[PDB]
Write a protein that binds this ligand. Structure first.
Ligand code: NI
Length: 146
């Protein structure tokens, strides 16, 4: 979990997790990717829309592209491939413990330095407020990991 130059040794892979894997986690993944170019950053959804491209609204919103993103179901097998798991909603943690018991010990909230709301099927203003949350949350994580 901490706390400096040591963090770079402990976490080289990060799994960003939301519900549908077409709004929140796609954005968070891309944000962390250009902040941590050396790390393995992917995403999944506890109730993902498998093989679905990123949501239209999420795509619209700063200026970063969601290139080649497809919906990915979260599985214990997948958790086994990542040092750190970041979830958007607190409910995800509980659903993670249920799906992958071994992963719970290595999962925290995206924006640990409050949870991020589900923008799915909401106004563009909601996507902006959420995006803002994702960006600043992604920055606090970038510094806390080098
Ligand atoms: Ni479909």
């Amino acid at each position: 979990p901490r706390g400096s130059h040591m963090a770079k040794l402990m976490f080289d892979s990060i799994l960003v997790i939301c519900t549908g894997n077409i709004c929140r986690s796609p954005i968070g993944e891309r944000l962390l990717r250009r902040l941590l170019p050396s790390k393995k950053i992917n995403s999944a959804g506890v109730g993902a829309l498998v093989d679905h491209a990123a949501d239209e609204s999420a795509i619209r919103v700063n200026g970063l592209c969601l290139k080649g993103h497809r919906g990915t179901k979260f599985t214990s097998a997948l958790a086994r491939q990542y040092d750190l798991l970041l979830v958007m909603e607190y409910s995800h943690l509980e659903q993670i413990s249920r799906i992958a018991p071994e992963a719970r010990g290595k999962t925290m909230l995206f924006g640990h330095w409050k949870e991020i709301p589900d923008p799915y099927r909401m106004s563009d203003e909601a996507f902006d407020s959420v995006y803002q949350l994702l960006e600043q949350a992604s920055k606090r994580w970038a510094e806390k990991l080098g």
